Swiss-Prot record, chain A:
GO terms for cellular component: ribosome. Stimulates transcription elongation. This is Transcription elongation factor Spt5. Heterodimer composed of Spt4 and Spt5. Interacts with RNA polymerase (RNAP) independently of nucleic acids. Forms a homodimer in solution. Keywords: Transcription, Transcription regulation. It comes from Pyrococcus furiosus (strain ATCC 43587 / DSM 3638 / JCM 8422 / Vc1). It comes from the Archaea. Composed of only a NusG N-terminal (NGN) domain and a KOW domain, similar to bacterial NusG. The NGN domain is the effector domain of the complex that mediates the interaction with RNAP. The NGN domain closes the RNAP active center cleft to lock nucleic acids and render the elongation complex stable and processive. The KOW domain may interact with RNA and/or other factors. GO terms for biological process: regulation of DNA-templated transcription elongation; regulation of transcription by RNA polymerase II; transcription elongation-coupled chromatin remodeling.
From Swiss-Prot, chain B:
The gene is spt4. GO terms for biological process: regulation of DNA-templated transcription. Zn(2+) binds at C4, C7, C16, C19. This is Transcription elongation factor Spt4. Pfam families: Spt4. Keywords: Metal-binding, Transcription, Transcription regulation, Zinc. It comes from Pyrococcus furiosus (strain ATCC 43587 / DSM 3638 / JCM 8422 / Vc1). The lineage of its organism: Archaea, Methanobacteriati, Methanobacteriota, Thermococci, Thermococcales. Stimulates transcription elongation. Belongs to the archaeal Spt4 family.
Length: 81, 58, 389, 97, 76
RNA sequence: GACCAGGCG
DNA sequence: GTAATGAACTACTTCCC
DNA sequence: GGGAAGTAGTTACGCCTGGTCATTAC
């Protein structure tokens, strides 16, 4: 269940690293993080539900919010290929 | 931080975590990371089997 | 809520909308539906519980255990509401000075310091988290004292306090808290240091607010006021006016509980019993308040308790009020007993020589302070040759 | 407030006491010297005093020895219980302008 | 207006136009590079909000744009 | 240049 | 070093059971 | 349908004095 979270377009690459570090602290049930550089200002996070991403997004200043609605996988193969 | 040309694995050291060879290109742009391959279906789509960071179009 | 048979009938009329239709969790479902319309089902319960905890009478606490006390307070408010309907209580007057409190420097500065410290703690948290994540745990635990010391930026507090004090724009939307001092001459500065301002808007007429009040006697100057639209809304303190500070409340409550007052939880109020309030909240009932008020005021005159405590009673509703908070405006008076003032010629002589001071006169019980509440029970004579029994 | 709860796995800080120091000013080159109201008025400075706070580090649930840090500066009401002009005589005030 | 301190003072319209241009450029780049619908359908709303505030800053049912000092901006 | 506060007829 | 945004009034219009 | 009920729009004219602005994390 992929979700999209908006971040400031200055340090998206550092944002991925800090989620990758933060996932260990509370052992969040999150499968994978995506953040291609071709798309600016947003990241893709895999999580079972909205509560998980909401809990994993708190405490980060650059994380502004999470967009409503699931982003389908079908819309994103052109990037991971 | 570098990335292997063949493994597509973004390496933070001189030696790749999965391969003993030290190969790099210093032209990686995309960043793909996976925490648990057993749960991440994106890893199943790409065929990865080891958790960590990966690139796509180096 | 209450025990009056008419109140019982009104309550029986009221219950049928929810007496046999809902339970404790069903009302929670209704509140969750309202506060979170069309949201997740589990989200609604938590949102409703949060709102109930920290938005309904927060001065009683935010713990879930205080819900019974919150229900008691709400029932008392509803009892007052329904008592107005039957004409058992005249409507309150907003301009009566017993219902208004002043804000001094010590509370505005408290609020400003609170908001600045709230910013500072979050900044420190962010700095510590980032430093530990970047450098690693070994650096943090190598020298913990240095790690704590070098992670504090002591500017977010100073700059935010100083800018707010300089511009005069307080947090929370208030404006004009701080003003430039008027230094034209002596009288201008001295009068500027004793200003009182109202938070109402200037443009609207406000016919009721701008008028003089009977309770202003001895607390507000009746003639010094601006001339333009600010007329009435800006006033100056009188010469006899004395503002009060605050004493701790737990000691006062535990002292009040020790002379016959039963707790509210143990016994339910009934029309034959007096009510007792402390700083606006109900704390218990007693069988006779007329003797209780006399005992408390006599103890205050003797010197057992502080002089900031004022006690008044209303026999129409059978209530007793006790106040110990700050912000009240009080004036001094001479105690008269048996038609004879307690001030004697020898007291005046002793004051003139220098052996006696004003504070000692206050302590000995000759002169006492009265706020707007105690003055309801008073009957003040104007001239020394007009006193009677 | 109580204290600070960072995301460090085994760290937490508990607040202690708070103190107010003497009214002073710090020159840009480093030194700190006493200040008086007329000097503050003439030089367009701010008449304030520093604040001190005690922080108690907690490691793995055990309190350590406390430390003290300066959190900022607080403006001082003139002729209050902490101002430099409290209790001075008339000639002392005359000598100070 | 050039301040004596050396910093520049600019009117509110300039700031609003800068914001509009930045948002438009980001939306155009996202559209050209390809993106999921949930991205462009949010940038579109953001651009519409910015334009609506630019034309009128007191429209019903919308948080007015706020300057760096907290004062609401003046617009056309 | 815009805000805030206080005055004058 | 810089790129980055975070109280009264009165007359209409919309309901509405 | 004609009763709520919820928007939506206004609220005298000059003049004088002084004070503050007009980002920040790395
Ligand atoms: Zn390799």
């Amino acid at each position: 269940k992929i979700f999209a979270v908006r971040v400031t377009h200055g340090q998206e690459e550092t944002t991925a690293k800090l989620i990758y570090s933060k996932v260990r602290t509370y052992n969040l049930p999150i499968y994978a993080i995506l953040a291609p550089s071709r798309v600016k200002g947003y990241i893709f996070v895999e999580a079972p539900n909205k509560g998980v991403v909401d809990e994993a997004i708190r405490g980060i200043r650059h994380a502004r919010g999470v967009l409503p609605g699931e982003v389908p996988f079908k819309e994103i193969e052109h990037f991971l290929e | 931080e570098k990335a292997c040309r063949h493994c597509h694995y973004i390496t933070s050291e001189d030696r790749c975590p999965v391969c003993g060879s030290r190969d790099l290109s210093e032209e990686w742009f995309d960043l793909v990371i996976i925490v648990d391959v057993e749960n991440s279906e994106i890893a199943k789509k790409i065929g990865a089997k080891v958790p960590g960071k990966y690139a796509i179009r180096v | 809520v209450g025990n009056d048979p008419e109140v019982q009938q009104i309550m029986f009329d009221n219950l049928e909308d929810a007496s046999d239709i809902t339970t404790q969790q069903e009302a929670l479902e209704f509140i969750g539906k309202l506060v979170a319309p069309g949201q997740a089902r589990e989200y609604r319960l938590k949102r409703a519980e949060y709102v109930i905890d920290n938005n309904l009478l927060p001065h009683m606490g935010v713990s879930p255990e205080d819900r019974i006390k919150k229900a008691y307070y709400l029932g008392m408010m509803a009892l007052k509401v329904i008592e107005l309907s039957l004409g058992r209580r005249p409507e309150d007057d907003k301009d009566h000075y017993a219902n208004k409190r002043l804000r001094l420097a010590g509370d505005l500065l408290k609020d400003l310091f609170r908001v600045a410290f709230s910013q500072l703690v979050k900044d420190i948290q962010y700095q510590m988290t980032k430093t530990y994540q970047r450098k690693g745990d070994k650096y943090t635990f190598g020298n913990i004292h240095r790690f704590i010391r070098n992670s504090i930026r002591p500017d977010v507090l100073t700059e935010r306090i100083e800018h707010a004090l300089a511009t005069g724009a307080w947090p929370g939307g208030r404006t004009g808290v701080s003003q430039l001092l008027d230094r034209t001459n002596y009288m201008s500065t001295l009068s500027h240091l004793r200003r009182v301002t109202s938070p109402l808007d200037r443009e609207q007429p406000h016919f009721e607010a701008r008028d003089l009040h009977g309770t202003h006697w001895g607390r507000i100057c009746p003639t010094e006021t601006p001339e333009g639209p600010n007329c009435g809304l800006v006033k100056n303190l009188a010469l006899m006016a004395q503002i009060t500070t605050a004493v701790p409340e737990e000691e006062i409550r535990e002292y009040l509980m020790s002379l016959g007052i039963v707790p509210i939880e143990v016994r339910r109020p009934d029309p034959t019993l007096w009510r007792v309030y402390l700083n606006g909240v109900l704390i218990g009932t007693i069988e006779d308040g007329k003797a209780l008020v006399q005992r408390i005021r006599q103890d205050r005159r003797s010197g057992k308790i502080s002089d900031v405590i004022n006690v008044a009673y209303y026999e129409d509703v059978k209530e007793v009020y006790v106040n110990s908070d700050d912000g009240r405006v009080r004036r001094p008076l001479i105690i008269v007993e048996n038609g004879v003032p307690k001030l004697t010629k020898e007291h005046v002589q002793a004051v003139k020589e220098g052996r006696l001071k004003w504070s000692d006169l206050i302590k000995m019980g000759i002169i006492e302070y009265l706020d707007a509440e105690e003055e309801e029970n008073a009957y003040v004579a104007m001239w020394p040759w007009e006193v009677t029994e | 407030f109580g204290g600070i709860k960072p995301d460090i796995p085994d760290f937490e800080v508990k607040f202690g006491k708070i103190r107010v120091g003497e009214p002073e000013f710090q020159e840009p080159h480093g030194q700190r010297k006493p200040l008086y109201p007329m000097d503050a008025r003439i030089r367009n400075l701010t008449y304030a005093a520093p604040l001190y706070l005690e922080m108690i580090p907690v490691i793995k649930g055990v309190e350590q020895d406390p430390v003290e840090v300066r959190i900022g500066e607080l403006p001082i009401m003139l002729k209050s219980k902490v101002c430099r002009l409290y209790g001075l005589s008339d000639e002392e005030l005359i000598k100070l302008g | 207006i050039t301040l004596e301190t050396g910093i520049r003072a600019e009117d509110d319209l300039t700031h609003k136009l800068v914001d509009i241009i930045r948002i438009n450029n980001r939306l155009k780049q996202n559209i050209e590079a390809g993106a999921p619908q949930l991205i462009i359908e949010d940038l579109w709303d953001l651009l519409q909000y910015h334009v609506t505030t630019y034309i009128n800053n007191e429209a019903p049912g919308v948080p007015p744009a706020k300057h760096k000092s907290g004062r609401p901006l003046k617009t056309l």
